[PDB]
Design a protein. Sequence first.
Lengths: 67, 67
Amino acid sequence: FTLLEIMVVIVILGVLASLVVPNLMGNKEKADRQKVVSDLVALEGALDMYKLDNSRYPTTEQGLQAL
Amino acid sequence: FTLLEIMVVIVILGVLASLVVPNLMGNKEKADRQKVVSDLVALEGALDMYKLDNSRYPTTEQGLQAL
């Protein structure tokens, strides 16, 4: 109640917490790439639409907000 | 009252105190390990959270107090 209730658990605690290694850190950073690479085709491909109707692309100061 | 009240008890005293051996000393030292091992996953796992929002970990002088 004081020893068995504790000492047995102290082991179970560390035995549990020791061999529980879920994963790494930084996988999201790899995801940031495709998130931007996905934009690349989506950006140029979307701009091409505007390059069709107005037959041209927006100006720098005009920015992508024109899209 | 003087002998039976005493001599019988002197035996009962030693007979009792002799065969009453509860436990060891130092079990707490073993507990100190899991207490720190429990922190290990809890430390890195907690730091990983900060490694997510700010996308990185705190500096040495910044210490864990940043967490």
